[PDB]
Amino acid sequence: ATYSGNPFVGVTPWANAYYASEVSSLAIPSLTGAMATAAAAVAKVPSFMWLDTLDKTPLMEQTLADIRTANKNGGNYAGQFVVFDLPDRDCAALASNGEYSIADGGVAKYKNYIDTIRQIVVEYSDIRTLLVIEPDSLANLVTNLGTPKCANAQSAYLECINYAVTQLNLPNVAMYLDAGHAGWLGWPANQDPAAQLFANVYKNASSPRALRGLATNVANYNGWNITSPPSYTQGNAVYNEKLYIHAIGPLLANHGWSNAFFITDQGRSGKQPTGQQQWGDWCNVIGTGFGIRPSANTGDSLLDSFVWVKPGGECDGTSDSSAPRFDSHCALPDALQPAPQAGAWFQAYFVQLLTNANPSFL
Ligand SMILES: CO[C@@H]1O[C@H](CO)[C@@H](O[C@@H]2O[C@H](CO)[C@@H](S[C@@H]3O[C@H](CO)[C@@H](O[C@@H]4O[C@H](CO)[C@@H](O)[C@H](O)[C@H]4O)[C@H](O)[C@H]3O)[C@H](O)[C@H]2O)[C@H](O)[C@H]1O
Ligand SMILES: *[C@@H]1O[C@H](CO)[C@@H](O)[C@H](O)[C@H]1NC(C)=O
Ligand SMILES: *[C@@H]1O[C@H](CO)[C@@H](O)[C@H](O)[C@H]1NC(C)=O
Ligand SMILES: *[C@H]1O[C@H](CO)[C@@H](O)[C@H](O)[C@@H]1O
Ligand SMILES: *[C@H]1O[C@H](CO)[C@@H](O)[C@H](O)[C@@H]1O
Ligand SMILES: *[C@H]1O[C@H](CO)[C@@H](O)[C@H](O)[C@@H]1O
Numbered sequence: 001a002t003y004s005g006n007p008f009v010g011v012t013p014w015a016n017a018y019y020a021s022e023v024s025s026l027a028i029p030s031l032t033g034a035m036a037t038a039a040a041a042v043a044k045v046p047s048f049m050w051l052d053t054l055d056k057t058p059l060m061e062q063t064l065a066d067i068r069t070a071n072k073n074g075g076n077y078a079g080q081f082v083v084f085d086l087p088d089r090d091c092a093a094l095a096s097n098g099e100y101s102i103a104d105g106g107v108a109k110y111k112n113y114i115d116t117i118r119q120i121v122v123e124y125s126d127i128r129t130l131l132v133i134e135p136d137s138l139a140n141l142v143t144n145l146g147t148p149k150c151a152n153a154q155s156a157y158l159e160c161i162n163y164a165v166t167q168l169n170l171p172n173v174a175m176y177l178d179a180g181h182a183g184w185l186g187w188p189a190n191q192d193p194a195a196q197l198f199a200n201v202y203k204n205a206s207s208p209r210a211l212r213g214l215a216t217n218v219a220n221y222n223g224w225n226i227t228s229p230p231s232y233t234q235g236n237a238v239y240n241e242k243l244y245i246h247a248i249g250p251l252l253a254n255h256g257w258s259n260a261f262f263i264t265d266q267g268r269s270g271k272q273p274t275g276q277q278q279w280g281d282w283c284n285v286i287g288t289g290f291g292i293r294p295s296a297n298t299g300d301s302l303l304d305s306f307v308w309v310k311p312g313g314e315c316d317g318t319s320d321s322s323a324p325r326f327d328s329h330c331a332l333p334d335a336l337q338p339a340p341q342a343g344a345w346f347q348a349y350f351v352q353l354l355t356n357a358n359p360s361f362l
C-alpha cells in the first residue's frame with residue numbers, strides 16, 4: 001500500500017462496479033453489435049468513484065472490499081475516489097449544489113463526512129488509495145469572489161479542505177488537490193494567485209506527506225497536449241493541460257510547495273477541438289469523446305498519470321429550466337440536450353463519447 005515516487009506506478013487502477021453497472025445496465029441494453037461490445041470495454045477502463053453524498057460512503061467500503069478480494073487473487077489494484085461534499089458546494093454554479101449548507105451546520109457535517117471516510121481508509125490500509133480532493137472548490141475563490149455564495153464560503157472551504165487533507169494524510173494514500181484547468185486558472189493572470197492559494201493550503205496543513213500534488217481538468221474537456229490552439233482559447237498561451245501544469249508547477253515551488261506533481265482528467269478530451277462555442281461553456285459539451293486512457297507512462301516530468309476522474313456518461317447538469325439546480329449553461333446551444341440532473345446517467349452523451357473516442361473502442 002505504501003509508496004515512493006509516483007503512486008500510480010506499481011499498482012493497477014481499479015474499475016469500479018458502480019460505473020460498470022451504469023454502463024452494463026443503463027447503456028448496453030440500448031446498444032447492439034459492435035457498439036454494445038465497445039461499451040463493455042469502456043466499463044473496464046478505470047475511472048474515479050465520486051463520494052458526492054454521505055450515502056455513497058458505504059459504497060466506498062464495498063469497492064475497497066472488492067479490491068481486497070481481487071488483490072488476494074493476484075490482483076495489485078488501487079482504489080480511486082473523489083472527495084466531493086463541501087458545504088455550499090459548487091459556489092459559482094447551480095447544477096451541482098450539494099446536501100450540506102454552511103448556514104445549517106455544514107462545516108460540522110463535512111468533518112463528520114471526512115471522519116467516515118478516514119475510518120474506511122484506516123480499515124483498508126492494505127489498499128493503495130488514490131484521491132482527488134474537492135473538485136470545483138478552491139478554483140472558485142480565485143476568480144469567482146464576485147459571486148456571493150463563493151465569497152461567503154471562503155473560510156468554510158479552507159477550513160474543510162484543511163481538515164480533509166490533514167485527516168486523510170495516511171501512508172497508503174495519495175491526494176491530489178483540484179486545481180481547475182488551463183482555461184480557468186491557466187491564464188497567465190490567474191497563475192500566481194492560484195499557486196499561492198494551493199501552496200498556502202499545503203503549508204497550512206503542515207505539508208502532508210500524502211498530498212502528492214494537484215488534479216487538473218476534472219470534469220472538463222481540455223486536451224492534454226494538443227499542438228494547435230482551438231479557436232475558443234484565443235488569447236491564452238496556456239491552451240492545454242501540459243502547458244498549464246508546467247506553468248503553475250514552478251510557481252508552487254516559489255510559494256513553499258516543492259515536489260508537487262499532477263494528474264489530469266482526459267475522460268472527455270478525446271476529440272479536439274471540442275464543440276465549445278465559448279471556452280467557459282462547461283455543461284454537457286457537444287463534440288467530445290473519451291480520451292487518453294489512464295496510464296502512468298506520460299513521458300512528462302510533472303504528470304504522474306492520465307486519469308478519468310469525471311465518469312463519461314454521468315451528466316453535468318439538467319437542461320430543464322423548471323428543475324431544481326437548473327444552470328443556464330446547460331441550456332446553451334453547445335450543450336447536449338435534453339439532459340438529466342448532474343451525476344445522473346445521460347445515454348446520448350455516453351454514445352457521443354463512445355462514438356468520438358480516441359483511442360477508439362470500436
Ligand atoms: C474562466 O474559466 C471558467 O471558469 C468557470 C468558473 O467561473 C468554470 O466553470 C465551472 O466548470 C467546472 C468544470 O470545469 C464545473 S464543475 C461541475 O460540477 C461537478 C464537478 O465539480 C460535476 O458534477 C458532479 O459529477 C460527479 C461525477 O459524475 C457526481 O458524482 C456528482 O453528483 C455531480 O454533481 C459536473 O460534471 C461539473 O460540470 C463548474 O460547475 C463550473 O462553474 C469553467 O470551467 C472555466 O472554463
Ligand atoms: C488553515 O487552517 C485553518 C483551520 O481552522 C482554517 O480555518 C484556515 O482557513 C486555513 N487557511 C488556509 C489558507 O487554508
Ligand atoms: C500526447 O500524449 C499522448 C499520450 O502520451 C501521445 O501518444 C501523443 O503522441 C502526444 N502528442 C503530442 C503532440 O505530443
Ligand atoms: C511502505 O512499505 C513498502 C514495502 O516495504 C515500501 O515499498 C514503501 O516504500 C513504504 O515504505
Ligand atoms: C495491476 O494489474 C494489471 C493487470 O491489468 C497488471 O498489468 C499490472 O502489472 C498490475 O499488476
Ligand atoms: C448498478 O448500479 C448502477 C449505479 O447505481 C445502477 O444505475 C444500476 O441500476 C445497477 O443498480
Ligand SMILES: *[C@H]1O[C@H](CO)[C@@H](O)[C@H](O)[C@@H]1O
Pocket residue numbers: 020021023024025039040041043044
Ligand atoms: C457491465 O457488465 C457487462 C457484462 O454483463 C460487462 O461486459 C461490462 O464491462 C460491465 O462490467
Ligand SMILES: *[C@H]1O[C@H](CO)[C@@H](O)[C@H](O)[C@@H]1O
Pocket residue numbers: 021022024025026
Ligand atoms: C446492471 O444492473 C442490473 C440491475 O438493475 C443488473 O441486473 C445487471 O447485471 C447490471 O449489474
Ligand SMILES: *[C@H]1O[C@H](CO)[C@@H](O)[C@H](O)[C@@H]1O
Pocket residue numbers: 026027029030031347
Ligand atoms: C438506452 O437508450 C435507448 C435509446 O437509444 C433508450 O430507448 C433506452 O431506454 C435506454 O435509455
Ligand SMILES: *[C@H]1O[C@H](CO)[C@@H](O)[C@H](O)[C@@H]1O
Pocket residue numbers: 032033034035036037038
Ligand atoms: C460485439 O463484438 C464482439 C466481438 O468483438 C461480439 O462477440 C459481441 O457479441 C458483439 O457483437
